[PDB]
Symmetry: D5
Subunit: 139 residues, 10 copies
């Protein structure tokens, strides 16, 4: 734990976040995500909701302006998604407003998770609660 | 995650709990515990309370009936404990929850140095550290 | 071991099952499978039957409903497969609710698929074609 | 697996048994033993009985004749030990020739001794005091 | 780098600072300190002043209040401390509130304590006796 | 060592043989084989002949009946083989010893690169390298 | 620290510069460079300006005369460089020729994936990345 | 394999032998020795007799003159030892004669094997075929 | 060090030389070669001349006779080789019999081959183009 | 290699010397020293004379002024040193004081177990071992 920094961010994630450079991507997945088979280093955040890390990390993480900074997974046809999830993610990320969030199909998302800098799997239970953040040029 | 098992328990902690044998000790510490300098493997559980992990693990973890299975830290001289902590931990570990005994910071740290693992949590209370001793799984 | 969880599941396997997410695949091979050269981590369960493991894991493992969750190996040219195997695998998998249909794929495609699995658990099953792949779903 | 060798013996255990020399000790513990904190390398054999392993290993493992080759744990104050355990352990060990007498030592001295063992194989034996230590001899 | 947190703190140091608990100790040494032979993990901070790093971490690092949290090295017989080093350090450490009195211990006593430190950050401070140890407290 | 098992087989090779599955390939090379630059794990057996290891392993190692289980190296153009080698290897691997097929140095090395392991021996003969493919243990 | 050698160079960087041979390329990046994602080993030099290292390094590092020895990043189209960055760099390097080649952001990343090492500095100036190519030490 | 050097010495043993300095000790044990539980690095020489390595290594290994260079294990009371074993060891080591060989009790031998530089376990089947060599000042 | 074998050969190099098989290649480069970026394991031999190391290993290293076993680097346009380097190398390599003709290939071709070498020994040879590659043959 | 720095110093030795701080001790041993048995990290410098390294190292390495900075091995009782060894060493070091302390063979080993590193050279001279203690870099 450290002062002025959300105690919800583990020491290892703190390191990962700092090591990230312009353009690096990090995923905060829901609890159902196959994080461990993607390839990048995985960090567990089992007792937390994605919205928890988002609000904890946003004052530290500059979002990329050179590319879509926020990406989520699109529900497969014949499946159900929750409208509220994306709503609080935006609220958690609004320091003030945050860029629009774009959804790509689940496979496209995995494909990109495979090249990500790291993956943080949380306890988010809602379906399709996975979100990718692309880092910008930290001022 | 997994069905019928608390998702608050990370897979690595699930492995640790399963590997532990009779007499093995694990510590669930508060956020201020010097967990990483004790020696045993450390598992972070930052967003959770000690009482959260205690209740999640108890239906899987039989407590030792051959020796004191629950050990907490005695307040250092010129300092006092928060009454709310121990009572909350007992509640979480309830068969009845065995009695809890206190031992000075020296003896607690000496045992922490030799514990099977240390799970550091987001528990903010002072003296929120607790040592559990595994018994024989029935 | 732990209470409420089958003792047949090793600590490492419990970790593996918990780490797996939606779509991840895990193989429970018979004793003849070339598990160690496939690529993924290998957990040995020598002396144990695949069916005994399936029955122990099924109450915690959600099978994928987004795609066929069960894949077995088709017999190779000239071989006859023992119907007793798939019969007791489905039974073990039907512990709480009947299990989905099992599909069969060419031995080469099975290996190519084993090369991408999350993990491989090699058991004591001595019958040929006793390998079965499981695909995890979304834990309800 | 391999021909002429029990399939119940994992590859790692076969290596371990072959590496052991005269006087080296290996423990086959029950499922309750604190094997992972003792120190020596641990091989898991979850779901398997100690007696089933002993019967599989005895034809390859020479028991030491220079010192007591079999050590078991004495029950702790208040506990009763099941005579059925030591009974089937000796039977399994008597596969080709009757096995030596088994000695019992205090739980603390057993652990102190486990800390020096070559390896520890934790099995699926669920009975208490199902731990047994074997000391290798000179392969004739 | 990150926003909010000073970029003078390398990602590895940030992780270290966060893992430290109440009572844990960290050394920010001058360029002449035998950092690598003490025992704990070392983080190089060549080119940076100790006072640069103290200012960077003070907003995140609560000092121990259960014991003297600031310790520097006493000058060895024949040498004499440069009070300006302490001034700079004191000002960096007093950016939020007056820092506790800074205690000075003998060279060898300092090394002994370093052997048990959580980590050691060797900087570019070229002034003699530019070493300082910080003890962590209960984070508010 | 171990009773009923050849002491010529090191514990590590004993582990390797046991881990190998159907279709897995292992090479027993002569002393001049570039074993350490192929890729797979290498096990030294310097004082032994390939025929020594072949005979020791055969009572434990069932050979593949689904594909060519024995592969040797074809002599490079402008070079010739020593007749005594292949015949000695067949003798060592005798159920009858399946037929042996030759493949150029390129195809042999390509497979060596992907083999499960390589056991380099003290076999001094030229082209004394042989690749065994494991079958289904009965 | 060592006499005659700039104390700004960490022992690890000293080792890296010494291990580099003719043609090897090293990058001293700004704080925003995605160094850890490229592939080569990374040396953190947080808080230091690129120009500080260049000045510290140049007396020991011979620049390649067989190929352009200095490469920088061209500004993203439509954007412009801060002329002070390169002026500061040219001075630190004590720079007849050689000139500084400028390659596009991604072309720069491509070449950085194959570099000997990447030293990420505390340089906050936009496009402060510079790649140096070692020559033959006189 | 290398020219002029016994092909019976594996590459790793070659390295160990060379890394050894004045006073370092190395054990060539029989096949019954508990080499792997002693502590030092172990090298397998399964198809060889101790006498094989001895004759292969002696032209490379200078024996210590500052201390007893050759030590073997004494048979426990109530056990049998082979007179020929020590005989050929001496013959193998005689390049020309080799120092006397002294026997210490089995436990004393293990105790010393625990601090040795390395242990080479061979296929020597004879009981008490273990021998320790102490390296001298290589000329 | 050892007797019989030249003490100029570090224990790690001796091991490497012995593990090499027919066709394996090793580079003894000059002090300016980019040894560490090629890919293979590197052994430092600072201070020693390439000709010093060639004399040391020739008695133990059979050259390949199935292909040109000796390869050096051609001078880059603008440069010119110092024939005395080759003389020294030739004499060291001819201590037991006339060494095969020494072939010279382009700089980049040499690097390409180095990426696939068994190992690289970078020495203190400060003359340009002091690099030489050896291909191992069937040891008599 | 690096300009201004002796090419005799390997990159790893350069790193080690740079990491050493005030009071740390480094040993440059002769070829007969049991370096790998002592405990500290070992850097091979086969073929090089101790005096060659000392000459290469001294311009970068400040000797301790707070404690005797040079220690050597006293000859085994009844034996004698070759005066040329130390004369050669004193010259390489460009050596008012300090004097060279001589400790018995085993006392030397004891201190070598706690040294920062051991560089084993090709020095064949009896008792060519020398321990240097680092001071405060000016
Ligand atoms: C079908 C999808 O599968 C994975 O991507 C999960 O992380 C999602 O939440 C969803 O269940
Ligand atoms: C004095 C004690 O120090 C550590 O053990 C903390 O984890 C406790 O909560 C308490 O503050
Ligand atoms: C031909 C097949 O080969 C492997 O896949 C074995 O695991 C099967 O049981 C069967 O023998
Ligand atoms: C009291 C004893 O504790 C451990 O040694 C267990 O392995 C035993 O079975 C018994 O429960
Ligand atoms: C004598 C002392 O030695 C070390 O502790 C240095 O870090 C100090 O600055 C001082 O030079
Ligand atoms: C040309 C071939 O090269 C290697 O494969 C050797 O192992 C063979 O015996 C033969 O010499
Ligand atoms: C757009 C570019 O992104 C990275 O390459 C940074 O290192 C540059 O300075 C610039 O910000
Ligand atoms: C009793 C002794 O035990 C070990 O020391 C063996 O290596 C000996 O050969 C002998 O059998
Ligand atoms: C131009 C060449 O570059 C490298 O290959 C050096 O090793 C050569 O000696 C030469 O300087
Ligand atoms: C007797 C001594 O043994 C070692 O310390 C050698 O390094 C010395 O040079 C001497 O030979």
């Amino acid at each position: 734990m450290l002062k002025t920094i959300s105690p919800l961010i583990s020491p290892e994630l703190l390191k990962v976040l700092a090591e990230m450079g312009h353009g690096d991507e990090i995923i905060f997945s829901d609890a159902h995500f196959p994080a461990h088979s993607m390839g990048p280093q995985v960090i567990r955040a089992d007792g937390l909701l994605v919205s928890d890390l988002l609000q904890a990390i946003i004052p530290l993480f500059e979002l990329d302006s050179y590319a879509p900074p926020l990406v989520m997974m699109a529900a497969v046809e014949g499946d159900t998604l929750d409208p509220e999830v994306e709503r609080r993610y935006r609220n958690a990320l609004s320091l003030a407003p945050c860029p629009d969030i774009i959804r790509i199909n689940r496979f496209a998302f995995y494909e990109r998770a495979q090249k990500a800098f790291a993956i943080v799997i949380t306890g988010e239970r809602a379906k399709y609660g996975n979100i990718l953040l692309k880092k910008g040029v930290t001022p």
